[PDB]
């Protein structure tokens, strides 16, 4: 149908906007601490601690399959990155501190993304 196509154009454009959001969030992680999945070869107990692992490469795979229906779903995954790190790692670690800084800096980007998603529909 023409409506299914219109819907698919909206999703594609949402995907375009989320790709730009993802790039901007990932720049706030210059150390690449959150770039890839935590390695289960190197942290064999990880899944005993963290039930829903997340990382920027895994988000990008979902993104490019147009697997985010709305900004809320994308933000859920970003929040998993931060929240998993802040539980697994102690306060006095470079990892925890990197998560705090990503959360704080990403806030600004996500604030304007929400306005853009509502504004453009």
Q: What is the domain partition of the chain in residue ranges?
A: 1-121
Q: What is the DSSP letter of 65?
A: T
Q: What's the fold here for domain 1-121? A: Histone Acetyltransferase; Chain A (1.20.920)
CA angle 9-11-12, nearest 5°? Answer: 60
Burial class (CB in 10 A: 0-12, 13-18, 19+), 34: buried
Instruction: Centre a 10 Å sphere on the Cβ of residue 93 and count the other Cβ atoms it contains.
Output: 12
Experiment type: X-ray
Tokens of 8: 């698919």
State the helix-helix crossing angle for 94-120 and 2-27, rounded to 10 degrees. 150
The terminus-to-terminus CA distance of the chain in angstroms comes to 21
Q: What is the DSSP letter of 38?
A: P
């Amino acid at each position: 149908s023409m409506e299914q196509v219109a819907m698919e154009l909206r999703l594609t454009e949402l995907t375009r906007l989320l790709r730009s959001v993802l790039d901007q969030l990932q720049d706030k992680d210059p150390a690449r601490i959150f770039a890839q999945p935590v390695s289960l070869k190197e942290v064999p107990d990880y899944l005993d601690h963290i039930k829903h692992p997340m990382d920027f490469a895994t988000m990008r795979k979902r993104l490019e399959a147009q697997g985010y229906k709305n900004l809320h779903e994308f933000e859920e995954d970003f929040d998993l990155i931060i929240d998993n790190c802040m539980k697994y790692n102690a306060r006095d670690t470079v990892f925890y501190r990197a998560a705090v800084r990503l959360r704080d800096q990403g806030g600004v980007v996500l604030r304007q993304a929400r306005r853009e998603v509502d504004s453009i529909g």
